[PDB]
Amino acid sequence: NVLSETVDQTSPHLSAALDGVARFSETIGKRDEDVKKLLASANKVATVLGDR
Amino acid sequence: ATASILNPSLVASRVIQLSPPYTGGPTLRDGAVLDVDRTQVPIEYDEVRNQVTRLLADLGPTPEQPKGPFGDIIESFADGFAGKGEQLNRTLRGLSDALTALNEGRGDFFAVVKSLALFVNALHRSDQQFVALNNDLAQFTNSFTNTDQ
Amino acid sequence: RSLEPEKVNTIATSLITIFQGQGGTINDILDQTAQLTASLADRDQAIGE
Amino acid sequence: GTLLDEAATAFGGLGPSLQRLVDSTQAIAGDFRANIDPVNDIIENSGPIIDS
Amino acid sequence: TLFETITAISEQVDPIKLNETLTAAAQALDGLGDKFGRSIVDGNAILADVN
Amino acid sequence: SSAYPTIERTLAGISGILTGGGIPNIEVIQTEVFNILNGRADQIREFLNQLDTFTDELNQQREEITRAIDSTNRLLNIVSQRNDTLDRVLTEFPPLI
């Protein structure tokens, strides 16, 4: 009964959340190599900054 | 060994089976006693009837809930996810891709976090010093640009 | 074999504890995350640049 | 039938992808908790320098 | 009547779609349930420290 | 004219569901679910509450996040188009310093 009530209540607000999460996740998901290269170079530069 | 009573079929002669076959080691000696902990009994038919009736009454339809808990959950999940299969698939694929990309660079990201932590922990106290430095730099450069040449 | 009473009872009680009266909380989560993620995704080109 | 069709559409061949999603989520959450002191330090001490 | 009702229910369930759905769910959770719960607890601590 | 399903046909449909439906997966799924919720229901509920709080507080700053994205984009574009000067500085200034 609790699962039925939760799905009944949260259904009308689910499609917009799915669409927004899909769009924002695909913003980064189609740039995986660029993001990882950015993280590596940022690791190098930030390590240089933090050590000094 | 465990002595379990077995009912082989619908109408049969019940037997006692010593469940673990012998593969070596110490053996069951003559005059041994097996207590209730190491014995088993068949399920019986009245127990089956009682449990079937109990589950069909507890988890079945009622006047307040005409469809039953399972009917209600099936109806709610069918109505609440109708047309959202493709949207959910796309959202899950995007989330998996993005989080996998973040997880592959997770070590680099948290090294960045620890380094920026050291940076801010060393530079945060002298903020008025930085404002004064900017103003003094502006004034010092103004000291040499009062005219064009 | 999947109908073991211990797992069924534990899962049932845990679901009751987690989702009792949390429909409004989950609705708020969905609305806020939808708005935030839509705003972020409206800057897809900016994020890429 | 409708619910089974929707579940098949949503979970057609997402086995490996959902496995990667869950593993990445747990790894990131654990690592983020492990480094919560640097995160708190960044959040606290970023504001003074930036506003300066 | 019982056989007719069970047949009506069984025609609705498709082994192909049910099989692929259950396969995806099992591959999703295989060996990671305890990790996922520990991650939820860790995220609870992270949010308690961030909010 | 019609015919009721026989016991053989009913059991054949049930057996088709059981053998072609991936039933052995279900227990595995259940096991993993049992691992998620074992002694953590209160913590999962309070995590839901804290997630609601965190998401609300982030959503209240969506305009500022957008403005920061735009500002960083403009600054990074200017520096990217001056990358040549950046390289010249990083080559010729460190020896002088």
From TrEMBL, chain B:
Organism in which the protein naturally occurs: Mycolicibacterium smegmatis (strain ATCC 700084 / mc(2)155)
Domain Mammalian cell entry C-terminal intervals: 27-149
Location of this fragment in the whole protein: 101 to 249 of 547
Alphabetical keyword list: Membrane, Transmembrane, Transmembrane helix
A single Gene Ontology CC term: extracellular region
Protein's name according to its UniProt entry: Virulence factor mce family protein
From TrEMBL, chain D:
Coiled coil, from the record: none
Protein name: Mce-family protein mce1f
Taxonomic lineage of the native organism: Bacteria, Bacillati, Actinomycetota, Actinomycetes, Mycobacteriales
Full-protein interval shown: 157 to 208 of 518
Automatic annotation (TrEMBL), chain E:
Superkingdom to which the source organism belongs: Bacteria
Name this protein carries in UniProt: Virulence factor Mce family protein
Organism: Mycolicibacterium smegmatis (strain ATCC 700084 / mc(2)155)
Automatic annotation (TrEMBL), chain F:
Coiled coil start-end: 44-75
Record keywords: Coiled coil
GO cellular-component term (any): extracellular region
Domain of life of the organism encoding this protein: Bacteria
Protein name in the entry: Virulence factor Mce family protein
From-to range in the entire protein, with total length: 148 to 244 of 390
